[PDB]
């Protein structure tokens, strides 16, 4: 599951479906440690990187 090369593992929606020209609105990451670190990385990317949005 980590570093998965099978795109079928990710659902069709929430995967840049109907991507906007100025906003891909999708990104995939596999952070180490707990998911709280991933949220902090998302929180770090929540400013000056993209307008606030949620993904699974």
């Amino acid at each position: 599951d980590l570093s998965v090369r099978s795109l079928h593992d990710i659902v069709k929606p929430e995967d840049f479906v109907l991507n906007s020209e100025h906003l891909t609105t999708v990104l995939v990451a596999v952070p180490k440690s707990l998911k709280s670190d991933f949220e902090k990385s998302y929180e770090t990317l929540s400013k000056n990187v993209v307008p606030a949005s949620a993904s699974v």
Binding site: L18, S20, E21, L23, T25, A54, S55
Partner: protein, 56 residues
Amino acid sequence: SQKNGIATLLQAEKEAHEIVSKARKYRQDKLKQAKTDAAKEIDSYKIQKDKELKEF
């Protein structure tokens, strides 16, 4: 989740792109109208010149 985030962006950016397409269409229509007006003005100038020659 993103039911009012990227989802609402998918309508805001959609409206922005629709406005871009409408602006392009309006520019093309204005180009056609300006060309028609220029042709009418050129025809009027030619008619005036022909009338001047006939008067001479």
